[PDB]
Ligand binder design. Structure first.
Ligand SMILES: CCCCCC/C=C\CCCCCCCCCC(=O)OC[C@H](COP(=O)(O)OCCN)OC(=O)CCC/C=C/CCCCCCCC
Ligand SMILES: [Fe+2]
Ligand SMILES: [Mg+2]
Length: 656
C-alpha cells in the first residue's frame, strides 16, 4: 500500500537522528510562561503537551516495583546519549575482564574470547568518539552534520551494551557453579577500599553516621526511648566516671540510630534461599555519644532489635576486655547490615531515584518545552527514566542482584522500598527540615558532620539560583497562580506521581523552595548517597545487607569464629564488589554546567536574561566554584576527606 511508504525505510536510528536535530531547533525558541505566550504559541504548546502524553505514560504496575509511579516505557529521546553509554560500557567491560581473569582458566574459557572482543569493540568506539570530536573542533561550521555520526556511534554502543547484557546473563546462569581472604579475592585486580583497613575501629564505625552513605538517620536524643533500657552504670563504663546520661543529654552529646522503619527488610527470623543459604537482617537501636570536647562520636551501646525483652544490651568494651570483644564486633556488624538495607532501599532507591522518576514524568507531560521551568528542570532528569527501568528490570527480579545481596524475600524487599517511596514527605524531606527535625542542625552541638555542612552550601547555592531564575519569569505571586501549566504539573505530582506532602503552589517563595528540593534531590542528594558505594560498600566484612548468622545472643564469650559465621557467602561478595563499583563509577553531567551532555554540548539556556555576563546562571556557577574551594579547605582540616558534595563531583541528574 502507498500508505506503507513512510514505514518502508524508517528505523530507530533515523528516528533518533531526527529527534536529536529537532531538539537543537526547539532549544532556540525563547521561553515563556503560558499566560505571556501569544495565541499561536499557546496552541502549539498545548498540542505538543497532548502528544507528549502519548509517549510519557504513568503506570503503577511496572515489573518488580508494583505501586510505584513509573514510566510505562522509556521514550526514544530518553535513551542515554553516547557519552554515558561509553563510560558505562567501559566500566562494565573492565569489571567483566577483571572477573573472568580471576576464574580458573577452565571456567574462564567460556567467557574470555567474548570479553576480549567486547573490549576491542569498546576501544574502537572510543577512538571513533575522539576522532569525531577532533573533526568538530577542526571544522566547527560543519559540526551540525557530525550529529548524525554521533547518532550512528550511539547505535553501535547500544549494540555493544546489548551484547554485554547477554554475556552477564550467561555468567549469572552459571553463578553457583562459578577466614576473610575470600573477601579480598573477589576484588581481583581492584584495590580494596580504605574502609577495609579501618572497619574494626569504633571511631570509624561511628563516623559512618555523619560522613557515610546514609547521613540521614542519626538524631539527637534527650531521653532514651522506653525500648532502649540503658542504665547509668553502663553509660559511665564507656564514657567515664564523671559523665552521665543526664549530663550528656542536657549538653546535646547523645545521638541515636533507630532502624524501626526497616519493617520487613529486617525479617523476623532466618530467611532460607537456594542461591545464598540462610540469611538474617535486623532493625537495631544504637546509641552514640560525643566526648565533652566534641572531637568525635563514639558508639556506646547497641541493642540488636526493637524489643529489649529478646535483645540484650551490648555495651562498648575496654581494650583489655577480651571476653567482650567479639560480641561487640558482632553487634556492630548487625548495625552495618541494617545500614545497607536502609541506605540502599530507602535513602538511595526510594528517596532519590524513585522520587526523581515522578518529577521527570510530570515535567515532560505538563510543562511545555517552551516553559522556562521545563528548560530549567529537564537537564536534571537526563537518563533518569532509563536508569530506573534498569533498576526495576535488572536489579529487582527473583534471583537478581538485590535478591542475592539483601536478606529479605525479594517480594518483601520490593514492597518495603515501594512503601517507603510512597510515604516519603516532600517538605519534611528537604535538607534543612531534615536537619531540624533530627536536632543535628547546630554545628556547636555536633561539629563534625560533613554531609550537613557541605550539603547546606550546595542547597543554599541552588536556592539562590532558583530565586534568581524564578525572578526572571515570575514578577509576582499572581504570575505563579496564573500559570496553568505549573498548576497542571502540581496536579500530576500529587495525583499520578503520588508524592506525599506535595501541595498547591501559591507564591514565588514556595515555588523557589519546591524547585530547590527537586534540583537538589536529582543532583547533590543522589551524589551524596550514590558515590560512596565504591569506596565504602564494596568490601563485605565492613558492610553487607545480609548476615549468614543470627545476632549475637550474648555480650560475653564470643570468638573470632562466631563473628566469621556472620560473613556472607562468596556469591554475595562477588555481586557486591561489581555492582557497587559500577554504580559509583559513572559521572555523567555536572551541576551548574547547563550544557547538553551529548554532542554538540549546546547551552541549555538561550534567554539572554539568564545567560548574561554576571547574570543568574553565572552567579550560580561562580558560587559553586566558591563552595568547591570551601570544601577543599575543610577537607585539609578533617580527619578524613569528605568529597561527595564537591560540585565538581555532583552530576546534574540521577543517571546511575
Ligand atoms: C544493589 C542496590 C542498588 C539500589 C539502587 C538501584 C538504583 C538504580 C541502578 C540501576 C542500575 C541498572 C543495572 C544496569 C546498569 C548498567 C547500564 C545499562 O543500561 O546496562 C545495559 C546492559 C544491557 O541491558 P539489557 O536489558 O539488554 O540486558 C540486561 C541483562 N539481561 O545491561 C547489563 O549489562 C547488566 C549489567 C549488570 C551489572 C553487572 C556488573 C558488572 C559485571 C561483572 C561480572 C558479574 C559478576 C557476578
Ligand atoms: Fe544511583
Ligand atoms: Mg532480632
Amino acid at each position: 500500500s502507498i500508505f506503507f511508504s513512510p514505514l518502508k525505510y524508517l528505523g530507530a536510528e533515523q528516528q533518533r537522528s531526527i529527534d536529536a536535530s529537532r531538539s537543537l531547533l526547539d532549544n532556540l525558541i525563547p521561553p515563556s510562561l503560558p499566560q505571556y505566550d501569544n495565541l499561536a504559541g499557546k496552541l502549539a504548546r498545548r498540542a505538543v503537551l497532548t502528544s507528549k502524553k502519548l509517549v510519557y505514560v504513568w503506570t503503577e504496575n511496572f515489573a518488580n516495583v508494583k505501586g510505584v509511579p513509573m514510566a510505562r516505557s522509556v521514550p526514544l529521546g530518553e535513551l542515554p546519549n553516547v557519552d554515558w553509554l561509553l563510560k558505562t560500557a567501559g566500566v562494565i567491560v573492565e569489571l567483566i575482564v577483571n572477573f573472568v581473569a580471576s576464574l580458573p582458566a577452565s571456567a574462564a574459557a567460556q567467557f574470555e574470547r567474548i570479553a576480549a572482543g567486547l573490549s576491542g569493540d569498546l576501544e574502537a568506539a572510543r577512538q571513533v568518539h575522539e576522532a569525531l570530536l577532533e573533526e568538530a573542533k577542526n571544522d566547527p561550521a560543519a559540526a551540525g552534520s557530525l550529529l548524525l555520526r554521533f547518532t550512528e556511534l550511539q547505535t553501535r554502543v547500544i549494540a555493544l551494551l546489548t551484547r554485554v547484557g547477554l554475556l552477564v546473563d550467561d555468567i549469572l546462569k552459571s553463578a553457583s557453579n562459578l577466614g576473610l581472604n575470600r573477601f579480598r579475592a573477589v576484588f581481583g585486580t581492584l584495590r580494596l577500599p580504605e574502609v577495609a583497613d579501618s572497619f574494626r575501629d569504633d571511631e570509624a564505625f561511628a563516623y559512618w553516621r555523619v560522613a557515610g552513605p546514609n547521613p540521614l538517620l542519626i538524631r539527637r536524643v534527650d531521653a532514651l526511648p522506653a525500648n532502649f533500657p540503658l542504665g547509668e552504670e553502663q553509660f559511665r563504663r564507656v564514657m567515664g566516671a564523671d559523665d552521665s546520661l543526664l549530663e550528656a543529654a542536657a549538653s546535646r552529646r547523645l545521638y541515636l540510630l533507630d532502624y524501626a522503619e526497616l519493617g520487613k527488610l529486617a525479617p523476623s527470623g532466618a530467611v532460607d534461599k537456594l542461591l545464598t543459604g540462610t540469611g538474617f537482617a535486623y532493625a537495631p537501636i544504637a546509641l552514640f555519644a560525643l566526648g565533652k570536647d566534641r572531637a568525635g562520636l563514639l558508639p556506646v551501646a547497641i541493642q540488636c532489635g526493637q524489643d529489649p525483652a529478646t535483645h540484650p544490651m551490648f555495651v562498648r568494651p575496654a581494650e583489655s576486655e577480651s571476653d567482650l570483644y567479639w560480641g561487640w564486633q558482632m553487634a556492630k556488624t548487625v548495625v552495618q547490615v541494617a545500614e545497607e538495607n536502609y541506605h540502599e532501599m530507602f535513602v538511595h532507591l526510594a528517596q532519590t531515584h524513585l522520587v526523581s522518576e515522578a518529577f521527570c514524568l510530570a515535567t515532560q507531560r505538563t510543562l511545555a518545552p517552551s516553559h522556562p521551568l521545563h528548560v530549567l528542570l529537564a537537564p536534571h532528569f537526563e537518563g533518569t527514566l532509563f536508569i530506573n527501568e534498569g533498576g526495576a528490570r535488572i536489579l529487582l527480579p527473583s534471583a537478581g542482584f538485590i535478591d542475592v545481596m539483601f536478606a529479605a524475600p525479594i517480594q518483601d524487599t520490593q514492597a518495603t522500598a515501594g512503601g517507603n517511596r510512597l510515604g516519603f514527605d516532600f517538605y519534611r524531606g528537604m535538607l534543612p527540615e531534615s536537619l531540624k527535625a533530627r536536632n543535628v542542625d547546630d554545628p556547636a552541638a555536633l561539629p563534625d558532620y560533613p554531609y550537613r555542612d557541605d550539603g547546606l552550601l550546595v542547597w543554599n547555592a541552588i536556592r539562590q539560583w532558583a530565586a534568581d531564575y524564578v525572578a526572571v519569569y515570575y514578577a509576582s505571586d499572581g504570575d505563579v497562580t496564573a500559570d496553568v501549566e505549573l498548576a497542571a504539573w502540581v496536579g500530576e505530582v500529587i495525583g499520578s506521581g503520588k508524592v506525599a506532602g506535595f501541595r498547591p503552589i501559591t507564591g514565588r517563595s514556595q515555588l523557589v523552595e519546591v524547585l530547590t528540593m527537586v534540583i537538589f534531590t536529582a543532583s547533590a542528594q543522589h551524589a551524596a548517597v550514590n558515590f560512596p558505594q565504591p569506596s565504602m560498600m564494596t568490601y563485605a566484612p565492613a558492610i553487607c545487607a545480609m548476615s549468614a548468622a543470627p545476632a549475637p545472643d550474648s555480650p560475653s564469650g564470643k570468638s573470632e569464629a562466631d563473628w566469621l559465621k556472620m560473613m556472607p557467602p562468596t556469591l554475595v561478595a562477588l555481586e557486591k564488589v561489581n555492582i557497587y563499583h559500577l554504580l559509583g563509577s559513572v559521572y555523567h553531567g555536572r551541576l551548574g554546567d547547563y550544557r547538553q551532555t551529548g554532542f554538540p554540548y549546546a547551552p541549555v539556556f538561550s534567554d539572554r536574561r539568564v545567560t548574561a555576563s554576571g547574570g543568574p546562571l553565572e552567579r550560580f556557577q561562580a558560587r559553586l566554584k566558591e563552595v568547591e574551594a570551601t570544601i577543599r579547605t575543610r577537607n585539609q582540616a578533617r580527619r578524613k576527606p569528605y568529597e561527595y558534595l564537591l560540585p565538581s563531583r555532583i552530576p546534574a541528574s540521577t543517571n546511575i
